[PDB]
Design a protein around this nucleic acid. Structure first.
Lengths: 53, 102, 47, 117, 109, 141
RNA sequence: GGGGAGUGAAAUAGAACCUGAAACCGUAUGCGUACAAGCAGUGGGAGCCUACUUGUUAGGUGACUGCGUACCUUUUGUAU
RNA sequence: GGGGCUCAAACCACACACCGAAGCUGCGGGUGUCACGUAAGUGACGCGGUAGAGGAGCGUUCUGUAAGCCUGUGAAGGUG
C-alpha cells in the first residue's frame, strides 16, 4: 500500500504542523535559588527547602 | 472638456491635456495632428454629439514618441502531434499629447 | 584574404540533420515515417 | 572536436525556469514540470488575447444595458435607435459615459429615443 | 551579534530543528534553562553550542550574559554517512546516518 | 482603460420587496438581478455592487398551475438512502422563507461572490422586518 | 567543532581546501492564506508592501472573477 | 444543465430589434508567390496542419584568419 504520487513540501509540512515541543514546568527554590522541574528534586539535591540527597 | 475621436480604427475618450498611445500614425515626432473625426464634444451640461460627426470640431495633438510596447509571446502547440511553434510580437504605438479640443 | 573568401551561392549546403528537435523538420523520425521495415536500422529492401 | 553540452543546457533551462517563476511547487522549480507549465501558460495567453476582446465587450454591453434601463430603454432598443440616428460610437465609450458622464449618456439615450427606436 | 557553530552533529536536522524552534527569540538564561531541562539529545548538543556562543560574546566582546538574546538559530544539513542494513531474501537497503550544522547567534538587541 | 468598481467605494441601498402574491421565480429573478448589481452601470463581475433586499411576506408567495401540491424540494443527507423531499405547501408551512431563499440562491452564481450576494438578501415571514434603521424604500410597487 | 588573533593579494583559498550550478533542506523580510471544491495557469482585477520620486511608473504578493481534464508514445480515437 | 417557468420564460405562425466566432470589416505589423518597377516599390492574391518534401537560419567545440585583438584597471565560468 503505497502512494500513487509523492507528497509535496506543503502537505509534508502540514503533517508536522503538530510536532512542536513544550516542557515549561520549571521553578526556582527559594532557599538555593536554582531552577528545577516542578515536583522534582533539584539537580543539587534539594526539595522544598530541604536537602534530601 | 472631453472628446471622442477616432484614430486607429477605434475611439478614445480624450481630455484636454492627456497623453495617449495610439496605433502608429504616419507623422514624425514633435509635429501636429488634427482629428476632424470627433464623435462628441462635451463641456459641463453642454454636450453635443455626432450627427454622424460633430461638424466644426477638431482635436489638435502633438506626436510625442514612436515606441513599441511590451513583447507578447505566441505559442502554438498540438498535444502529441509533433507540433510546436513560437513567435514574438511588439506592436507599434504613437504617443500623442492632446493639445486642444473644439 | 583568408578572412574574406567564400564559395559561390549554391555550391555548399548546410547538411540538415535528422533527429535534432521538433522545430527543425526532421525530429522524432528523421524522414523515416513510422513502424515497418524501412524505418529500422538496416531497414533495406533488397534490390 | 568533442563538444561538452553542459554550458548551453544550463542556460536553456535557466530561461525556462525564469519563465516559470511564481508557480506552485515543482511547476516553478523542476524543469520537466516547469517546461509544461510555461507551454500551457503560452497556450492560455494566446487564447486569452482573444477572450479579452470577448469579455470586455460583454461588460460594456452589460453596463450600457444597465444605464439604458435607468432611462427607460433596453440595450437592444438603444443600439437600434443609435442607428436610426447615426452615432458611430462604440460600446467602450458608451460604457465609460454610463459610469462617469451620466448626463452625456442621458443625452445619447434621448437622441436614441428621439429616433423612436 | 556573535555566532557559534557546530559543523557535524550526529543528530539529523529534522530532529534538531524541533529544539532549535524552541529557543529562538528568547533570552539567553531562559534558553539555557529550557535546554538544560529538555528531554532530548538535540538540547544537550544545542546547549553546548549556546554556551559557546555566549562565551564567545563574553571573551571576544564585552557583552554581559544578562543582556544577551539568542537571535538566530538555524540548523542546516551536514554530510550523511552511507551504510548498509542486510534485509530479508538477500535484499540490501541503504541507511543514511544524517548529520547537521547548528548555528546559534547571540545578540543584545 | 475601463472602469472597475472597487469594493471600498461601492454604494448600496436597502430595499423592501412585498411578496404578497408575486410569482416565485419572477420575483426571484429581479431579486437576484439586484443582488448581483446588474441594474447599475457600475456593474463589475468580480465585485458585488448589489443592493440589500428585504422580502417581507414570504409565505404569500405564489406558484402557478399545480406547483403548490407538486414542486418537490430535495436534499440528500449524506447517508445511504437519505434522500429527503418536501413539497411547496408543506415547506411554506414549515419554513416559509426557505422557498424564496432557495429560489434566489439557485439564480445567483455558485461562487464565493454568490455567497456574498446571498448574504444581502433578508427574507422574512410576516408583514414587518427588523431593519427600520437601514431605512429601506419599497420597489416594484 | 567553533569564536577571535596571526599568515597570505585572497581563508566564504583552512587542508573533505580552485570555481562551486541544479535537484533537495533551512533562517529572515514582504504580501496572500482557517465558508472554500478539480492539470494549479491564463484574461480581468481591488487591496497591501517596498524602491523611487510621486505616476497615465518599477518590483513583490494576488482577495475576487471569466475561460481552463499535464507531457509523451501509440492509435480510428486518450484527461483517460 | 440548474434555478425556475403556465394570457409562458412551452408550442404553432408572422414581424421588428439585439447578442453571438480566431468568420467578415476597420486600424497597425510581419511574411510567401506572381507581375510591374533605371531595382525602394508598389500592387494583387495568399499565410491551420500529422507523415513527408522543399527553403533559410541560430547556437556549442575545434582549426585557419591569429606572433592578430581583448584581458589582472580583471578572461572563461557562475548568479542577478
Amino acid at each position: 500500500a503505497v502512494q500513487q504520487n509523492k507528497k509535496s513540501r506543503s502537505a509534508r509540512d502540514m503533517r508536522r504542523s503538530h510536532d512542536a515541543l513544550e516542557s515549561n514546568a520549571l521553578s526556582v527554590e527559594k532557599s538555593t535559588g536554582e531552577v528545577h522541574l516542578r515536583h522534582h528534586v533539584s539537580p543539587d539535591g534539594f526539595y522544598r527547602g530541604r536537602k534530601v540527597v | 472638456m472631453y472628446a471622442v475621436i477616432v484614430t486607429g480604427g477605434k475611439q478614445h475618450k480624450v481630455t484636454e491635456g492627456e497623453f495617449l498611445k495610439v496605433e502608429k500614425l504616419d507623422v514624425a515626432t514633435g509635429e501636429a495632428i488634427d482629428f476632424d473625426r470627433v464623435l462628441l464634444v462635451a463641456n459641463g451640461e453642454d454636450v453635443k454629439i455626432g450627427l454622424p460627426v460633430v461638424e466644426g470640431a477638431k482635436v489638435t495633438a502633438e506626436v510625442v514618441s514612436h515606441g513599441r510596447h511590451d513583447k507578447v509571446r505566441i505559442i502554438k502547440f498540438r498535444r502529441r502531434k509533433h507540433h510546436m511553434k513560437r513567435q514574438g510580437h511588439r506592436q507599434w504605438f504613437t504617443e500623442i499629447k492632446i493639445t486642444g479640443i473644439q | 584574404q583568408l578572412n574574406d573568401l567564400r564559395s559561390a551561392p549554391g555550391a555548399r549546403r548546410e547538411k540538415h540533420r535528422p533527429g535534432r528537435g521538433i522545430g527543425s523538420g526532421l525530429g522524432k523520425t528523421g524522414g523515416r515515417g513510422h513502424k515497418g521495415l524501412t524505418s529500422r536500422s538496416g531497414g533495406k529492401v533488397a534490390p | 572536436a568533442r563538444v561538452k553540452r553542459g554550458v548551453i543546457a544550463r542556460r536553456r533551462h535557466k530561461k525556462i525556469l525564469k519563465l516559470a517563476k511564481g508557480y506552485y511547487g515543482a511547476r516553478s522549480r523542476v524543469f520537466r514540470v516547469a517546461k509544461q507549465a510555461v507551454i500551457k501558460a503560452g497556450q492560455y495567453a494566446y487564447r486569452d488575447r482573444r477572450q479579452r476582446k470577448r469579455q470586455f465587450r460583454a461588460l460594456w454591453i452589460a453596463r450600457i444595458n444597465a444605464g439604458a434601463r435607468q432611462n427607460g430603454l433596453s440595450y437592444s432598443r438603444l443600439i437600434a435607435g443609435l442607428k436610426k440616428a447615426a452615432i458611430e460610437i462604440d460600446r467602450k465609450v458608451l460604457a465609460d459615459l454610463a459610469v462617469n458622464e451620466k448626463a452625456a449618456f442621458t443625452a445619447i439615450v434621448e437622441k436614441a429615443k428621439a429616433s423612436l427606436a | 551579534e556573535v555566532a557559534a557553530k557546530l559543523s557535524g552533529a550526529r543528530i539529523s536536522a529534522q530532529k534538531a530543528r524541533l529544539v532549535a524552534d524552541q529557543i529562538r527569540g528568547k533570552k539567553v538564561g531562559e534558553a539555557l534553562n529550557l535546554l538544560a531541562f529538555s528531554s532530548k539529545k538535540a538540547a544537550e548538543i544545542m546547549k553546548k553550542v549556546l554556551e559557546s556562543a555566549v562565551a564567545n560574546a563574553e571573551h571576544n566582546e564585552g557583552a554581559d550574559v544578562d543582556d544577551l538574546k539568542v537571535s538566530t538559530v538555524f540548523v542546516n544539513e551536514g554530510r550523511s554517512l552511507k551504510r548498509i542494513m542486510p534485509r530479508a531474501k538477500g535484499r540490501a537497503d541503504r541507511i543514511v546516518k544524517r548529520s547537521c550544522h547548528i548555528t546559534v547567534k547571540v545578540a543584545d538587541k | 482603460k475601463t472602469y472597475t468598481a472597487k469594493p471600498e467605494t461601492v454604494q448600496r441601498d436597502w430595499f423592501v420587496v412585498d411578496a404578497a402574491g408575486q410569482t416565485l421565480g419572477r420575483l426571484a429573478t429581479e431579486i437576484a438581478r439586484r443582488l448581483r448589481g446588474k441594474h447599475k452601470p457600475e456593474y463589475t463581475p468580480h465585485v458585488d455592487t448589489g443592493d440589500y433586499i428585504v422580502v417581507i411576506n414570504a409565505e404569500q408567495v405564489r406558484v402557478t398551475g399545480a406547483k403548490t401540491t407538486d414542486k418537490m424540494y430535495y436534499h440528500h443527507s449524506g447517508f445511504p438512502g437519505g434522500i429527503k423531499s418536501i413539497n411547496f405547501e408543506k415547506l411554506i408551512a414549515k419554513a416559509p422563507e426557505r422557498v424564496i431563499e432557495t429560489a434566489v440562491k439557485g439564480m445567483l452564481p455558485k461562487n464565493p461572490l454568490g455567497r456574498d450576494m446571498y448574504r444581502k438578501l433578508k427574507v422574512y415571514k410576516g408583514a414587518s422586518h427588523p431593519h427600520t434603521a437601514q431605512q429601506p424604500q419599497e420597489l416594484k410597487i
